[PDB]
Design a binder for this molecule. Structure first.
Ligand SMILES: [Zn+2]
Ligand SMILES: [Zn+2]
Ligand SMILES: [Zn+2]
Length: 178
């Protein structure tokens, strides 16, 4: 197994996957690493199994159909993995915890949003369709772009949004286009 967490790239108290060489901090894995379960299989392994059981699940899909899917267990897992892929980028630190807004010339968003809030919402099964989760994720970056206006710090929102969108297209097998 690896000697650093796959998500945050630090050592510490790590739980090892039984079916691949990745390791995790307890609350770095999503969902949080399970208390028992020997052997234990990480989210990466669980996602790979879904694709292996249904190879046609990788044929292209329309985003509009994906968003209307109900959050059954396989879609719940996919959204957990997509959230985890965002946390894997170190620039996700900027969007993880609850923001506050006091900048001359800007007003805070009407509906603040952050990664840990999305994480809680997934854990608590508050999203009934994929659309719920994707809307809150995109709102994180939209709020950031609007607030920071012409400051160069707006670029961090563009950067982390790009990681979200690339992973969304991969995990949900969105049809490739020009
Ligand atoms: Zn970690
Ligand atoms: Zn694994
Ligand atoms: Zn199949």
């Amino acid at each position: 197994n690896s000697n650093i967490c796959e998500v945050c790239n630090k050592w510490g108290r790590l739980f090892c996957c039984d079916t691949c060489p990745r390791s995790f901090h307890e609350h770095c894995h999503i969902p949080s690493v399970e208390a028992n379960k020997n052997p234990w299989s990480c989210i990466f392994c669980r996602i790979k199994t879904i694709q292996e059981r249904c190879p046609e699940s990788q044929s292209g899909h329309q985003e509009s159909e994906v968003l209307m899917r109900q959050m059954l267990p396989e879609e719940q897992l996919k959204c957990e993995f997509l959230l985890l892929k965002v946390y894997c980028d170190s620039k996700s630190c900027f969007f993880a915890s609850e923001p506050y807004y006091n900048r001359e010339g800007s007003q805070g968003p009407q509906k603040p949003m952050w990664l840990n809030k999305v994480k809680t919402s997934l854990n608590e099964q508050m999203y009934t369709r994929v659309e719920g989760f994707v809307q809150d994720m995109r709102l994180i970056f939209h709020n950031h772009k609007e607030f920071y206006r012409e400051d160069k710090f707006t670029r961090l929102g563009i950067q982390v949004q790009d990681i979200f969108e690339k992973n969304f297209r991969n995990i949900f097998a969105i049809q490739e286009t020009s």
